[PDB]
Design a protein around this ligand. Structure first.
Ligand SMILES: *Cc1c(COP(=O)(O)O)cnc(C)c1O
Ligand SMILES: *Cc1c(COP(=O)(O)O)cnc(C)c1O
Lengths: 825, 824
């Protein structure tokens, strides 16, 4: 009944419904007869894209005219998630789009579930970049992100009898309705080759392989603003002419298409396995490709904004480049190359530009994690860059000899090049610190450790280089849009919706935390979210969960330091206790549904064993009629932004239980706190700040602290460790065969012995187990006291304002980038 | 200045311009600032696509409701060309689109030149399929074409100083604005594997590789009708899940992506080189992929039209036409789908298959008919080999039961050739045995099929063999490529109804001596020649004189096509001009010779011939003594667009293949339709063209087909007496006048009396004197302007028979038994 009527500016239900039908008919991607939920998704996304194109174009023109200083964020990951709800929400068209879809015979949630997550990232590094983009838009800042257009993500996780299996993501196998290809925005990127030296001393990288970098824009709308910025993604392509017809017609198909193959490899997956030389080279190719394409584009834009060609001295006053971790380190020597070789600048001029343009964000505690590459591999793949890095290092060392002779003895550790006789490498973090005008960590304690310990000598050389910028999360995706009913309650009680862009207003809830009407609304909202989560879990796992039970969630990368193993051993203990109780005693317990999710790196044997263990435990627990009214255990598969958007709103307790000292941050922790989920956790990462903000009384702390961990490991080494019998009992119960034929002995050996690699319980699972189980008992007692629990939940949201990514990005803008709002009129 | 305003039904200049600006903004594929001619092309194409989607949808719905018998044309090639002018033309929106683009600051010609030809074919076989689609639409017939969505065509031809170089086509490297992907229309296609025998006795093809066939529609609009049919093209794809992450993460990238690689190979190029086993297998994969995907889709559509269906209805509702033997596997594939997937018994399945499928043959030489190793067929398509063996077993039994007189010919009539050295499957035999109808493509060709090639099959099935003379669409090939000439025709016939009733062109005959018509005719040709001269200068750098006789030869470069004869005649003409006193040169007819065509990359002498033409041109065109009287240009990258530029400006075209070697000749028909006279042998479509236009309006020369064997024997026996002009031309090439390239090796092909690659098998020497004498007749005729213009008018006037509308009407009535289904 609704006829096709194009209206790219559609802003009421009738206009929008017409525009959707228009796209279904005139932007077809399927046979015309059926308009199923899939077709409806694409046509709805296309209708929204019309609004986004108008705004993206206006923002591009405005920034071009104003010629502001502009930030470019380089990241190897973006966890964009699904775009639909966010687009609708930022445009403030929820009502009109819901009504439009209803007139076409669909509920918006049916359609939203058809959208595949954009598989452009893996973990928190990527989700940080994605929150930052939302905040850049909303704060009206002239800032873009650049990334790679990965076709297959990291992997889609499936759970079989074997445990985790890894399959390629398929988000682009039909098409993405959000992106906009820019066929005119193509830049050449070279690999391998050699350096031509001209008679005048100029140098030019030549030969090797050349791939084409093709731009795709993903519009990022801001909340309550026209400003719509870009995540510009690069696809690596060979040219049609790079196919060798002679070889193809000789039947040598692989040889014929070898450049196409090498191009496709770049954007196949995130973090391609690098145990082999081929894989190391591919990782470096991906990093270089991102850096080179992006910087070429940035330079082109700098010039196109000229009104006269413009002075290079203006460049660092008009461009900021932020490196998210060390992955984009090659931006340093690449910008040098582009300035000196392609644009003729002398070294000193080029260095002044580069050093004032680039800043570095570090995310880590362990020096062992910081990227290093073989000098031989770098010479092979990127010879001109190795020449430039050698000169950076030569000049840096000379600075020490000229100005800081007291540090002469530390040249070997401070240099970018490690000339170890066996394994010479380039220390990428050293290159970043030496070259960047600013270095920042991602939480106060993390940033303090970077200054005091990891990079102390560099701090001595450059006393103002190092900063802190505490991470944050966007309260659009992570509260307003994922939990709209709770959001409406917040708005009602605060008497304003301005908290959506001024998150510290949430503190206005504190005065009402004992208000029984608010507690009742809060409980009702959580209940509706729990019911939705239970529906989701049943659909994706087949397990029916009881929404009156305590929902206890641990979702993050599977790793020994994250201690999913501790959680599951506690579950095994709780199960064994329940089995041993008489029914009268079981009725005294707090019923609980334990949900654990996350991905294991495919070659990480114990992480895969842990996924297998969680599933095997669940299979037994969930099917035992004697305890399954009190305990169920589910492994939630394929954790990604969409899964997070389902879990977080329905969560009551979340676990952030990593060995103390091993986490720099913890943005998921923030998301949970913001949504009224209480935390059981170690004094570690973002838990420190969350506990400070929400109050110690509204958090369940346990475990060794960071400063104790070395003593405790030494006590274990010295034979002084006294394991709690409940821990031994849990381990032995896993080893008893109760969970089936799989032998968990090898996994649990990691907890045995007193010393040795892969042994001796390095992550203190045994040591922390008793205080962990005691904190879980406190959780149970707290959960029985409903009024008390709801007060804690309200106070958790109420104290969450500091964690806004708007606060984070405003700080980067003022203190690092020196950019300011540029609102599109 | 002009505001974006969507209107998918735009039919006036203002509405159209708004819609173009709307697509430029809201269907972007580039940065938004610049609206250059490329961006304008895509936005204009998208505007037209809106009109085409409406009509394609209406046609699909109407055919679904009516449930007519529907034809499906299977072809390994389609030469679609550029779509823009044809779309505008068939929608009758020329004025409104021209005006709309002008308001946006462009002439339609600037935009039309930005469009890349759809590189979906190579030669006449493919252009025939494409003309047929246009006629199917225009005649309101329920008929589709299926094909492969080739990414890189055959090759784009580049001319360097070294001669031809071959590079992949790039028409899809950005995107094609015409096509419509159908992500729901995906069928699995298997390769390799084995035949499972089920407990009940049924059989199932299992294991091996499975690729996904994804459909894209290319709407084909009809002239003066809403009817808009499809060219449905298949892309071979692997699934994301077919990438092996373990291998990829181990750095074994080729292994990890091997299924993706094998899928991509299917649609990389036309006619992938097959000197190796790999290449033979890839050719068979392509053919099977086309057949299997298309048949699965056809069967799906047959069922979807059910209102409540019986398999007995299938041959009453489906016709499948095989364009050459490339789609031969449609026969055993339909059998497999019917018997295995749908449970039919052999006899029922065979009745359906044999009544559904018909075969069009295009070949003179039996050596050209496709044969495949039995071993390769078993390896790639084991279930199909089981089926082919049973077809053959039953056929041979029919001979033994009903035609005992042919028992001694079973070895040559069987589909399987069990020659102990090289056992093969004879695909043409499988096609003739299985198809209810077989046709050739010209009367003489069809007569030869019946009398010689397939005489015994004709004896077995006296009504199976037919003729359907080829044709060309007078939309693309007259109305749209030559609008000014078309307006003259309309004026003089007092109607434009000839555009769909081409025999009305005979009404020009009465005016062929008319001084006013001759004047308008000459003016139109002159304007086309000036446009061609502009084009030639742009693409070759050579300035040509539009007052000279434009002499064109464009087709595949091959020894049997005799470009070598043409260029030797040019060399001779050049030498004579150089030797003449200026007073004698002023008595000659100035001529510009244009030669174009592609050489298969491994075909050494064909590449040498391209090199020769360019080398001769380099010398002739820069010689100030003679270049006012003769130039010779190699026109690069011959394709539909090049034909659209050359044909309208042509005055003489050469169709000079050794007699007996051409079945047809559709380009010949295009030239005749545009008033271009032919110098040619009595061969292929020249025979019919000469009949229709009159012998006095055609320049015939050369041996006839029946003489060729005698002439080759005379050469073998040492009795050949070469004309001194031929020897003089050859020696001049060998003299080094055309530079450092040694043409000795090429010309050795013309030397000796016997042996493969020697002895002038294609009779270049023998036919040279009559060819040169015919060229002298051309010159004398060209000096008599009134006489020439009369011939030109009579050529167009007699061209009606060559309409593809006539051809397709005949297939529809005599083979397919389908009829008009006009969309209201
Ligand atoms: C927020 C989020 C993260 C954050 O990572 P952690 O470091 O685990 O706190 C990771 N993945 C997803 C899908 C997220 O939404
Ligand atoms: C018409 C046409 C042909 C026809 O081929 P013949 O050479 O006459 O067999 C081939 N190529 C193109 C581009 C055509 O337009």
């Amino acid at each position: 009944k609704i006829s096709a009527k194009a209206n790219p500016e559609a802003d009421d239900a009738t206009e929008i419904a017409g525009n959707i039908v228009y796209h279904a008919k005139y932007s077809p991607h399927f046979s015309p007869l059926k308009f199923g939920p899939e077709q409806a998704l694409y046509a709805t996304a296309e209708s929204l894209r019309d609004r986004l194109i108008q705004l993206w174009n206006e923002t591009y023109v405005h920034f071009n005219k104003v010629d502001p200083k502009q930030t470019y964020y380089l990241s190897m990951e973006y966890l964009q998630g699904r775009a639909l709800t966010n687009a609708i929400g930022n445009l403030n068209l929820q009502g009109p789009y819901a009504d439009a879809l209803r007139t076409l015979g669909y509920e918006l949630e049916e359609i939203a579930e058809q959208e595949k997550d954009a598989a452009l990232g893996n973990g928190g590094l990527g989700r940080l970049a994605s929150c930052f983009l939302d905040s850049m838009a909303t704060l009206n800042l002239p800032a873009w992100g650049y990334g790679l257009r990965y076709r297959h993500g990291l992997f889609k996780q499936i759970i079989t009898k074997k445990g985790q299996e890894e399959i390629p993501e398929d988000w682009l196998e039909k098409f993405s309705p959000w992106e906009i290809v820019r066929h005119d925005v193509v830049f050449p990127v070279r690999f391998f080759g050699k350096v031509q030296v001209n008679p005048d001393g100029s140098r030019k990288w030549v030969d090797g392989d050349v791939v084409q970098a093709l731009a795709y824009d993903v519009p990022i709308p801001g909340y309550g603003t026209k400003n719509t910025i870009s995540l510009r993604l690069w696809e690596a392509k060979a040219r049609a002419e790079d196919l060798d017809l002679f070889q193809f017609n000789e039947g040598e198909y692989e040889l014929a298409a070898q450049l196409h193959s090498r191009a496709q490899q770049i954007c196949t997956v995130l973090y391609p396995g690098d145990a082999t030389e081929n894989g190391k080279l591919l990782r470096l190719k991906q990093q270089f490709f991102l850096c080179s394409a992006s910087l070429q584009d940035i330079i082109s834009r700098f010039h196109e904004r000229s009104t006269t060609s413009r002075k290079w001295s203006e460049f660092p006053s008009k461009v900021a480049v932020q490196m998210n971790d060390t992955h984009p380190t090659l931006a340093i020597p690449e910008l040098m190359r582009l300035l000196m070789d392609d644009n003729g600048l002398g070294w000193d001029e080029a260095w002044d530009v580069t050093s004032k343009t680039v800043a570095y964000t570090n995310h880590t505690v362990l020096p062992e994690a910081l990227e290093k590459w073989s000098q031989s591999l770098m010479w092979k793949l990127l010879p001109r860059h190795m020449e430039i890095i050698e000169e950076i290092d030569k000049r840096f060392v000379q600075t020490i000899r000229d100005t800081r002779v007291d540090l002469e003895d530390k040249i070997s550790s401070l240099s970018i090049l490690d000339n170890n006789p066996q394994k010479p490498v380039v220390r990428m973090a050293n290159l970043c610190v030496v070259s960047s005008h600013t270095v920042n960590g991602v939480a106060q304690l993390h940033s303090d450790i970077l200054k005091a310990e990891l990079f102390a000598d560099y701090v001595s050389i450059w006393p103002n280089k190092f900063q802190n910028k505490t991470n944050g999360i966007t309260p659009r995706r992570w509260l307003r849009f994922c939990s709209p009913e709770l959001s409406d309650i917040i708005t009602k009680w605060l008497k304003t919706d301005k908290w959506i862009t001024d998150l510290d207003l949430l503190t206005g809830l504190r005065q009402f935390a004992d208000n029984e009407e608010l507690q009742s609304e809060w409980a009702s909202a959580k209940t509706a979210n729990k019911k939705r989560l239970a529906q989701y879990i049943e659909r994706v796992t087949g397990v029916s969960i009881d929404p009156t039970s305590l929902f206890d969630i641990q979702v993050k990368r599977i790793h020994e330091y994250k201690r999913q193993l501790m959680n599951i051993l506690g579950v095994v203990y709780r199960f064994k206790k329940l089995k041993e109780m008489k029914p009268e005693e079981r009725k005294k317990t707090v019923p609980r549904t334990v949900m654990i999710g996350g991905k294991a790196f495919a070659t990480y044997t114990n992480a895969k064993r842990i996924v297998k263990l969680v599933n095997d435990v669940g299979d037994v627990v969930n099917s035992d009629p004697e305890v399954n009214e009190y305990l169920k255990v589910v492994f939630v598969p394929n954790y990604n932004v969409t899964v997070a958007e389902m879990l977080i709103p329905g969560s009551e307790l979340s676990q952030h239980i990593s060995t103390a000292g091993m986490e720099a941050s913890g943005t998921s922790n923030m998301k949970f706190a913001l949504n009224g989920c209480l935390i059981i956790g170690t004094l570690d990462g973002a838990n420190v700040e969350i506990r400070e903000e929400v109050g110690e009384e509204n958090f369940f702390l346990f475990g060794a602290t960071a400063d104790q961990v070395p003593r405790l490991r030494k006590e274990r080494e010295d034979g002084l460790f006294k394991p709690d019998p409940r821990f031994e009992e849990a381990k032995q119960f896993v080893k008893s065969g109760v969970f089936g034929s799989y032998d968990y002995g090898p996994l649990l050996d990691s907890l045995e012995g007193n010393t040795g690699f892969g042994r001796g319980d390095y992550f203190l699972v045994g040591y922390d187990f008793p205080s962990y189980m005691d904190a879980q008992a406190k959780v149970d007692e707290a959960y029985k006291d409903r009024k008390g629990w709801l007060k804690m939940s309200i106070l958790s949201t109420a104290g969450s304002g500091k964690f806004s990514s708007d606060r984070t990005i405003a700080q980067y803008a003022k203190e690092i980038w020196n950019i300011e709002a540029c609102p599109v009129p």
